[PDB]
Every structure is written in structure tokens, then in C-alpha cells.
Amino acid sequence: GIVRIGAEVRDGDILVGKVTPKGETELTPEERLLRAIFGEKAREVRDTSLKVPHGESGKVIGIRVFSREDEDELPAGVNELVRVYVAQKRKISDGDKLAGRHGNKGVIGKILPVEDMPFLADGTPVDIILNTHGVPRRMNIGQILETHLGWCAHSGWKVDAAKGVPDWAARLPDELLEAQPNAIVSTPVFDGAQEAELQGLLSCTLPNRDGDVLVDADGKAMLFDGRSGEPFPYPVTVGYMYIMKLHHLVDDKIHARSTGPYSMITQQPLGGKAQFGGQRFGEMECWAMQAYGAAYTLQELLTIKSDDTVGRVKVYEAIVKGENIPEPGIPESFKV
Amino acid sequence: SQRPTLSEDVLTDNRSQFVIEPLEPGFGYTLGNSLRRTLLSSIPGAAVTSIRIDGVLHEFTTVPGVKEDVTEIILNLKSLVVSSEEDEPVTMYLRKQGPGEVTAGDIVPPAGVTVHNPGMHIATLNDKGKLEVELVVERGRGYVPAVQNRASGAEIGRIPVDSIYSPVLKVTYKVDATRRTDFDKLILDVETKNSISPRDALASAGKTLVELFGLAR
Amino acid sequence: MLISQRPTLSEDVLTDNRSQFVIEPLEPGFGYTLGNSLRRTLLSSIPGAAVTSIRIDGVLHEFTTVPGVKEDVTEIILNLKSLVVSSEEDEPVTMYLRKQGPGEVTAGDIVPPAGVTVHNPGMHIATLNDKGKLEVELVVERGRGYVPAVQGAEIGRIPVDSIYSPVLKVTYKVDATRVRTDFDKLILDVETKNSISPRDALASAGKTLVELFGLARELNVEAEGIEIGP
Amino acid sequence: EEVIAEHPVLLNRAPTLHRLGIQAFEPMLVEGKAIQLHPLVCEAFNADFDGDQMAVHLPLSAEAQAEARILMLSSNNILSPASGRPLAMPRLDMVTGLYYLTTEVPGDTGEYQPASGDHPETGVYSSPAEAIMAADRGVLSVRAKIKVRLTQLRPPVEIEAELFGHSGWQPGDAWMAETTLGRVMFNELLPLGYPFVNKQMHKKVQAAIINDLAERYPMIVVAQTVDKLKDAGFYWATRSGVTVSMADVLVPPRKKEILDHYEERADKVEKQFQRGALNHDERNEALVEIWKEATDEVGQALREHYPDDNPIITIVDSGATGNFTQTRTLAGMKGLVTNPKG
Amino acid sequence: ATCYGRSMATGKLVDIGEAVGIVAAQSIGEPGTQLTM
Amino acid sequence: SGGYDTPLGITNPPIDELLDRVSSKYALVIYAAKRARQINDYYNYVGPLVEPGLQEKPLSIALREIHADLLEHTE
Amino acid sequence: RSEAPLVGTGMELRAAIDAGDVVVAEESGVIEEVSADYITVMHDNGTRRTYRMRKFARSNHGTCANQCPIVDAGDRVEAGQVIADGPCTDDGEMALGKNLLVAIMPWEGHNY
Amino acid sequence: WLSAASFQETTRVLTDAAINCRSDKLNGLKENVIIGKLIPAGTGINRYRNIAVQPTEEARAA
Amino acid sequence: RRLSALGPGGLSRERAGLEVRDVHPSHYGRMCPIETPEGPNIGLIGSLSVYARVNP
RNA sequence: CCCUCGA
């Protein structure tokens, strides 16, 4: 009854079949009819299998099982234990969170085809487009300075040093007077690359395979609009920046519930994605709804969408049967 | 009005420039970009669809005696460039016993399909390592992610793989504007992946574009 | 490899010289690969006739003033630029407009030499007061697109801007509809002159572009994306 | 897609600080796992895209759906319910777009220059379509001052009074405007028959236009206007050339001399302190006065040195985003810092 | 309605059912986080 | 109504012309929703009164009805 | 696949080593055997030492802890040298992200 | 007393309401919110809640 | 490497004023003044400085 | 409920 190693699993796929003793009074009339007709003498049970939770998918990496029949330390009353391990290969997506090292966070708005990206003069499409308006007021031009250095290290440089070493390079650079492409450099905090030395490296940048200097001495470049083809009218700062995939991904966060479990005390929807819960329409939300004068929406939210235990069922029944949504009942939490 | 001509200019075996002139003033950029957007996206190719490895049932594991795990092997198999004329799924095989490198040249392709970079590194085997792989190759275009095992009728052993069909590598252009009879000279620059030649890819882009522009006509 | 055939082309005619065309559904990205290209072919690549230069007798010393006319010289040029003309001559052609007396001069008020035609004859060009008289020479040539003032020593010859292109304004937008919600839908808004309908403008642009990309296909006729219906 | 059609959904972002923190929308089915949120409602939700999340609620009953469509629809809630002014206004990128689109540049490409000698004036256009064709060639700049014959844009109150009746005008009535092609396009975004606004579109000016529209036009008109403004502002912000680089962060040239001067004053104050003439609180008070003043002078000498088209200056001064003390701490100086005690 | 004036949200005179107390409390509270020392 | 762009989807018919037909937005909510309940009960009790769209929700029909003044109301 | 930053500080390496997810050689030796599964170094002592690789382990937070050998058979390694990379390490240095070609510009409001 | 007890200082309000045999008219909106009745505001007002809708005789004909 | 202010025998969260959360001049070289949470734990969770060591 | 994190 355990899913086989290597299976691809989707929402609701059984991972481990399990049944729980039910009791004849809990058989539905259809289940009672079916069990009588076909003479099923098997003990009445309800399906309590472990399924794949909503919006999760992957490959079964490994099964691990402990038994009471075998000598396996288990809690009291616990007979069989099984862990299915599922692996998903998550690609980067709209809604994932990225950030550099300078507090420059964003979510991904759009993943464009390669042909749509602005590209350099040699056809190289840029990888990521960071909006200009976000930089100056957050006081992190480190992200820009890094970008410049990132370009230099990517292209490699060789300072002149003929007829003497220049003035900007005099102070620090020494064996930093040249660097091979995709060089690996360090900017120690409070002792890193000074501004003048940074500007100097932007001049002696090595070219690409065609002898072209693609990034000028300001750190800017001419880009072509990949959508139309016309060049963008002004030199744009381009360079290389370290970007991190932050552990806030759409896959973990998307959630939706039509109907699901309810708390036994209050009869209101459970809470949390993991429990297939419903969103909390809180107090300030009800003020918002009241200020609109949206009375029926507010009632419906507060009776049939959470608390009215007969109106819930009659509303789902109405929607499924194609007729008008009925009138609310009394919230169970008022009786509580 | 002189009719426009297109003249090729080979740079390397997999790179060519293409001079188109004379063109209306202001028109070169758009023409070159239509060609670039077609080349980057719609040039047909072939690539690997799925692979099957002997002792493995899924991606996330190791083969004995090999240095790379199966994920790293598949990543190396992403760099593989291949041609096929069979337009229907066909199988390559890869049997090798260590010690030694497994390169793409060790792949035994069926007639009609060709492995173009035999030097490419696939895996490293030692005394105890034996690699026994099957690689399905199909013909397609664009980039098609791994096809789920429930979309195809695939059984548990099959490892689907992301497929980069596009055989073109890098495309750019520049125009020379003469500005009284003004005109634009367009210079396309196309580099491919040894699966086809710049000329062939550009011919394919031109066929696609002709058949799509015939709509307004 | 394998081919998809579904793209179709529909037209909503807004006015007699303005139409919106929809091309859908395009495989994703193609709305922009043939959005800007179709537009610039529509604008700069359709041949048409227009005025290159005018000569207005009666005043050659002081520009931007004319006796007996309430219209400025700049306003007369602005009008004569908006004069829609079609001609068959491969060489420049000369027209002449002369009308006297208090009244209103129009476009048909000019005598079109053989072959050329005046399509907007009811177009106001100037008004004349008592003792008013107009004698003015116009030069019509064939061309493409829009060329600015192209300039000798002939005293009194004013070169103008040549709106050769039969089409006047073109815009485009790419929207999304698919089989997938990301396939491209191209929408071209093309407003032309009285020389040709938007239909003919689009057809001529498609012709020039088919030839242009056939140039590339010619390298080695070979495999590429095909359709069933055109 | 069949059932979703025309079935409104409520979007909420917490904290709901006012009723506009819940707004109804028509859902378009989207590819991916994220909610796409129209950029003009951000201000209302105080939503940015650094990881914010939002809640979706589906009204069921005819009454709840009707309350959603009528009472709560985003385009029916353009105005702030606290101040009565609009909120769904172009905010940052849009601002830089429009401010770039409607700025006049002395000496730009294709500028009108009057007839001098045998040469004509070479700046006048029979229609905005002709100016578009000019700008298709490298001949006319979108921001160059020109003269155009306008037909479908209402003239300014003064020009319309002079060349017509006081309210006499029609979509046919032509006139001569000395504007930029950009300002022609901007005004073509505004509703038909709105007086032609020939101004650089600082944020305050756009606020004026939208306040006037909301005072005098129906809601739907303001909504379609601001949508059009959004489109244009984004398209032109892309092409505005506003970027950041270490080069554009110009330093004040006199900074050393200024700071040395105010250090001279501070040294006077401290010599006055050790002499016994100043109380400790008075020493700190005089020092803070000195350094406030030095910071102000550094900020000034900075503003004196930045060209008016620098992207940092442009972004601040258009009203798009930011203020100038940010620019002063970026280039210039941070200044005085507070205590753990304040 | 006439004493209250226009509904700030709509621009027209306030409709007969409006709950202006909640709108007032919200309008006063919303900028409260801007108030510093 | 003159020169206006034709509204799309939910924003049609426009809310100003609809508010011309009723006293307050609240009256319009109840008007349209009660009519919509009537329409949906009809499919299982008069109407619809206008040409229904291909697959149009009953509330959209009711709103178009109210726009064309095809029905009356009291308070 | 992990990729150290082109631009870093001196801190990446020393933070990876001390974090522990990187496999480090206790003693100098020669790599007697290398597989994806483990690494054996023959010390000059004559003794052997074998480091088993964590392969696709699940972290407390659902991220993949996958160690990967960076040595080859026959290689000479000293004590303190990294033998295998961890989850966010590249050749011994902490590699938390990727080097991306960035453009600083508004683009049609999609990065608004 | 329902409105007061749900706002703040619940124990005190409820002790007093008990001593005083207070009877809540249940007329405020919050009270209506708590019990699940349409709030007396906006669309919940009797003026709007009880609208009678029917087609016109002219439109009912055709 | 974290230094946490809450816990048994430490200070309680309802008594976590604002001044225990400030950067204190004696933190220099001991507790990093940058790394701390933005939300409700600000100034209650710091991290040890690079060269710092705890004495017996 | 508490812990750590998110806007």
C-alpha cells in the first residue's frame, strides 16, 4: 500500500494507503447497500490514507517504515510508521523572491523570452532587469558599485602600467593591475575597492571576442530593445550582480480553499495552508466591509462561509444544483 | 529603387554575417530584429527527451563508482549537441566500464542521428564503476521542459529531461545608415551550435517569416 | 519541427480610410516579431506621390507673408502638404494653381497635368479678398515614406516636406489569447489617405515583406514552421 | 474560463487601514501561481512587490456579487474616502515617463527655428501624424519645441477665446500650437475636449489635471484616463534614460572647503568650552547649530553642481520618488546622527 | 446628508445609508503611524 | 452618450448612467440582485427581458435590463 | 549547481569551512578512491580515512543538503583542505547565489 | 451590553449587565454583526432592503 | 552564534523596553549592530561579532 | 498559546 520508489505524484495521489475502523452506524446508505449486496464481510473502515497535499508534486525519493511486529521503538498504541520522501525540482517562477546582498529584494514580475530582453551590441541578452527608481532612496548604491566591479571581474582588465603605474592604481592595486575574465575578487567591508580605483578599472576592461568594448567608462552600455529592435536611446548601466533565490517561493505560498476542515470548538474553518485552512476575515476587514455598506457580503462572510453549519451545506448544494444561494442561519460561535 | 540583396560572409564554420541592402531608412533594425527573434525561438533542432540508467529509478541518487550523481550527469548531458533526421523518437545507448572518462563520443547513436561534440565530459568512472544509459532523441523546436511521466505513458524507470532544441547560439545585428537617396544596410551576425550552419538556420527563419507574413497579402 | 496552422486575420473598418486588423492566434512572441516590422513596412515602403517644392509668384522677398490672402505662407505650405496626390510619372511633374477674385480656393481648383490626380478636391487651401489673385506652382514626385525639406539658386523656390507615404498613422498592440494564455494577438490600427484603402496598404506591405524574407529563404530552401490555411 | 467570466472577486491586503484596503476586481485567468495586481491600486492597498501577499474572496450570492460590482469595484473607488481626492494616480515610473514625455528641450532634434534669410522655418507640421513620421526618422525629437496644426485637441482657454467663440470649438476646428510632440501625445491621452495643457508634467501638475477631471467628469472617465496615462508613462519611462551609476553620483566640488570652514567654527566653540565659557549642553547646542548649517551648505553646493537632467535629480524633482536630503546623504554628507537617547 | 456634505469617496452628496462613523475613524487612524515626536 | 470609449466587462454598463435610474448605489445593489435572483429562478418568474449573451451571468442581464429601463422598482 | 560570486569579500571561504556543511580533510594524504558516495584518502601515515557524502538529504527547512566531491583520484590534499562542496559552497567558498547580467532601467512597468 | 462587552473590559461590563438585567435591543451594527443579521447600514437598511422589483407592463408585453 | 535576550532567567518579552533593543556603545566588536530581525524580535536577537570570544 | 520568520 506504499507508493513505489520513483513514482511521479500529483495532488491527492495516495502515498500510503491506510484505513481506520469506522462502525456500522457510520456507513453511508450507499456504502451499506454495496456492502450488503456484494457480501463484503471485511470490517467497515473509512479511508484515512496519506495523500499528496494540494499544490505539491515530485518524485518519491525514499520510503522508510518502522513496524511493531519487528522490534522498532514506537510510541504507545502506534503500530506502523512510514515516511515517504518527495523531491521537487523547482524552477524560478513569477512570484519567487530574489535579492542581492544589499537589502535589494523583489519578487519576479515577468520571465521574458530571451528574444524580448534588452541585449548588448553582440546579441548577449541581459539576465535580470532591476528598476532604477528603487536604488537611490534606499541608500544602497553598494548594489551599483558591486555591479561595476562585477562587470570588471567578468571581463578582465589590464591597467596600462607602461610609462609608469597611474595615480588611481598607485595606492592599492598590486597584482590587481590585471585580471583574466571571470576573475574572483574580494571587497572587504571598510577596506574594499575605493571609488577612484573602481572608476579606473572601468577604463581598462578587456573586450569580448571581437575586440569590442561593450561597457563604457561610466559602466553603461547601449542596449537594443529585443521586442521591436530599435536601440534604447540612452546608455544603461549594465554589469554583473550576485542574485540569491530567497526561500519565499510561490509554490509554498499559493493557497486556495473552497471548503474544508472546521474547528470542533467554534465550527469555523481551520487555519493555515498545511491544514487546508480558510483566510481570516478579521475585525478591521469587517470595518472595511461596513464602511462600504456591503451588508450582504459581510453577512455571507460571517455566516455561510464560516459558521452556519446548515447554511454551509445548503449553499454548496445550491451552487452545485445551479440555483440561488439560500438565506444565512445562526453562527455557531454565537451559541458557543 | 534597386532590389535588395542578401550576401553571406563566413567567419567560422558556425558563424556567418549576412549583409542585406539597400533598405528603407529606419528599417534595418526592425528587419534584423524580426530575424533575430525568429532565430532565437523557432529554428528546429533535435535533443534528448529522456534517459534511462541501469541501477537507478529516479534522478536523485548515485551510480556506484561514478563521481557525478545522476543530477550532475543529466546537467552534463544538457550541454550535449545532437542532430536527427528521424523526426520520431529514437534511442541512443551508452555502455562503459571504468576506470576512465565517459564522454559523448562513447554514445552509440542509431543511423540518422549524429553526436557533434564527442569530447564533451559526461561522467568519471573508477575501478568499480559501470555506466549503462539509454537516451531518447526527438526532433522539436524551442525549449520544452521535462514531459511528466503521467502525460506520456512512461513507467517509473524513465527520467525525463529538459530539452533545448534550438541549434542557434547567438544572434546580433548592426545597421549602417547613409543619410538625397538615403538607405540602411543591415548586417546580421549568426552563430550556431555545430548542429546546423548559420546559412541553414537563417533559411529556416526566412521560411517561417515568409509563411507568416503571407497572411496580410 | 511540427507545425501549427491557426493564425487568422480579421478587419474592423472604423472609417473609410482607417481600419483595425487583428492577427491571432500567433505562437508566443511573434506578435512583436511582426508588429514593428509590419508597421515600418506600412509607413516607409509603400510608394506614393507628393509635393516636393512650391513656387508662389507675387511675393519672393519676404517669406511668411502674402498680399491679398488672409492665409500665411507657412499655412499655405501646411495645406499643400496635406494635398493627397497620385501620379504615374517616374520624373517630377508640375501643377499650377491660379484663381483670382474674392472667393475660396480648393484642391480641385487646380489643373492636374496628365496622369496625376487630385483625390481631395474639396480641400480648402486659401481664401481671397477683393482684388485677390493666386498664381502658384507645385512639384509632384514619386517616393516612399517621409523626406524633409530637400534643398539651388532659383530665387523663390520653397522646398517642402514630402509626405510620400499613402498611409498616415499606424500603431500596434500585442495582447494575449491562446488555446495556455500567452500566445500573441497582434492588433494594427492603420489610418491611410484617399489613395488606397487600409486593405491595399496592408496587402502591399505583406508583399514587400514576403519578398524581403524570401531573400533569406533563398539561401537554402529548407524546413521551417508551416500552416494549413493562409 | 466560462464560469470565471464577469464573476467579481474581492482582493484584500492586510493591514486593512481603510475600506479601500478591500477592492473588487474582475479576474482574468493568468499563467503562474501569483496574483497580478494592477499598478494603480498599489497606493490604496499600500502594496509594493517586495514579497507582499494578498487574499482573495469569492462572493457567492447575487447580493454579494452585486455589492462587489457596484460598491467595491476598483474603478468606482478611485477617490480617497478620507480626503475626497484621487489615489489611483501615476505614482513613480509613470511619473518619470510623463515628465520625460512632456519636457521641452531647447535645441533638440527637429526644433522649430524661424525663417532666416532664404531658409524657411522648418519646424511646422500639418498634423501630429506628420510629426510622428518625422520622429520615425532621426529628424524630430519628441521633446523638441515645434509648431503643429491640431484638429482633435481643444485649444487653451485663451487661444480658443481668440480664434473662436468663448466655447465655440469642434473636433474639426484646426489651430496652430507651439508645443512638443510629446505634449501633443499627452493631451491626446486626456479626454476629448479637455483644454490643451502645454506644460511639463511634474507630479503636481498631473495631480491638478486628475483632480480637475474628478471634480468635473464622471468616475469612469477618470479611470480610463489614468489607465491611458499608466500605459504611456511606462512606455516612456523605459525610454527616458533614467539609470544609476557611480558616475551620475556627482560629488560637491567645494565640499572640503565648506567642511573645513565649519570645523574652524567648531574648534572655536570647543576652545570656548575648555576655557570654561560654555556649559556642556551649550557646547553641544552650538556644535549642533554649526553642523546643521554645514550640512545645509553642503546640500546647497550639491544642488548647485548637478545638471538638471541627471537621473537622480530628475527622479527627485519630477516628484516620481524620493526627496533631496536622500540625495544629500548619497552624495554630499550624512550629517548629524542621533543617540540611543535621541 | 446635507449637513455631512459630499461623500469623499464618491464626490456626490452622501447617500442615505452611509456608515460615516467607520469611514471617519478609518480616515483619522490611517495616517496615525505618520505622527512622530 | 456622446464620445466615450466603450466599457469592458464588469465596468459595463457604466455606473453613472445606472445611478441615474436609482437614488443611491445601495438601492441599485438590491434592485439588480433581486432581479438576478428572479432571472436564475426562471431557468428552473419572468425574463430575461434583453438579448442574453452567449453564456451571460443573470446579474449581468439584470444590470443591462436596469440600464434599458426594462423594469421598475419601489422602496 | 552552486556558483561563487565574482564579487565577494574575504569572508565566504572561512564561513563555509566553519559552517560544517563542507567536507574537510582531517589529515594530509592522497585520494585513494573517489565516488559520488564517498571519498577515501590514504594518509602518509599508512592509515586510511573515508568521508561519506551526504546525498540529497532533507534539511530542517526543506532545502537539499547535497555534498559533492571536488577532488580526483590521485590528488594530493593537505589537512584543512576542502574535499567536497556542500549545499551552498563552490570549491570551498560560500556560494549563496548566482552571477547575473543585470541592467538598471525601467522596463514597461513589469519591474514596477 | 453586547457592544460594550465585545469592545473592552468584558468582565466588568458583564457583571453589571447581569446585576442590572440589561436587555440589549440588538440594534447596532456590531451587534448585528455578532449575531449574523444584516447590519443597519448601506444595503441592510429597510429603505433599500425591501425593494420590490418587477418588469414594466410595456417591456413585459414585448 | 546568536545572542538572545529572552528566556528563563533572562528578561521577559512584555518587559522588553526600547532601550534594551538599541545598539549600545559597548556592543562594538562584540555584537554586530547590523544583523538583527526587523519584526517583533528586533534588538532581542543579535549575533556575535567576527573576532569576538566569550570569556570564562 | 509559544518560537523563528514574512509584508
Ligand SMILES: [Mg+2]
Ligand atoms: Mg511590501
